[PDB]
Amino acid sequence: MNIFEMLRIDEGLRLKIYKDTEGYYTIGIGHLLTKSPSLNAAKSELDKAIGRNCNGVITKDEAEKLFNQDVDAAVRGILRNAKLKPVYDSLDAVRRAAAINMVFQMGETGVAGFTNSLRMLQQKRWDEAAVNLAKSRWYNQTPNRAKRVITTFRTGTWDAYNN
């Protein structure tokens, strides 16, 4: 297990534009295209991202390319964020993957807003952190996914992903 396999489990793989859990146009492995309700706007973003006229459909190789970029972008987001970087630097590799997962799903700004959880994580108060993390819109809207990510922070194991 690693961050790629983890996110592939959490996000799935779809080769045609679909709507994510928030109703937003998405493709591939959780590649958000736009928050606009315009399918045409989403198709335009897709064509810009892939570099050809795709008419809403991509290949598996293209999906994996966008995914690799998106994982890289999440890590970059963390390292450039003054709230996230000290916590990330404090974590072991397994828990780092949990943090990347969160940023992938919610964005850098959104995760930087989990001030109290981040402090508990930095303190290595894992059970406390896990309780605090679940007091969130995130948990309430995507509870099975959030439970997996929280288990990963709580235990520093991949036990929630041995599917």
Residue numbers in the entry: 1 to 163
Excerpt from the paper describing this PDB structure:
To demonstrate the versatile applicability of spitrobot-2 we demonstrate reaction initiation and fast delay times in three independent model systems, obtained by single crystal rotation data collection: Streptomyces rubiginosus xylose isomerase (XI), human insulin (HI), and bacteriophage T4 lysozyme (T4L). Using 12 crystal structures of three independent model systems, we demonstrate successful cryo-trapping via observation of conformational changes and ligand binding within 25 ms. Spitrobot-2 is an integrated benchtop solution for cryo-trapping protein crystals with a delay time of less than 25 ms. It is suitable for monitoring ligand binding events as well as conformational changes of main and side chains.
The biological function of T4L is to hydrolyse the β-1,4 linkage between N-acetylmuramic acid and N-acetylglucosamine in bacterial peptidoglycan to aid cell lysis. The L99A mutation of T4L forms an internal non-polar cavity of about 150 Å3, which allows the binding of various ligands after large conformational changes that open T4L to allow ligand binding. As a result, this particular mutant serves as a model system for studying ligand binding at allosteric sites. Our spitrobot-2 cryo-trapping data clearly show that structural snapshots of the binding event can be obtained at delay times (1 s) inaccessible by manual methods. In addition to indole binding, we clearly observe a conformational change in the backbone of the F-helix of T4L in the indole-bound states, which is shifted by about 1.8 Å compared to the apo state.
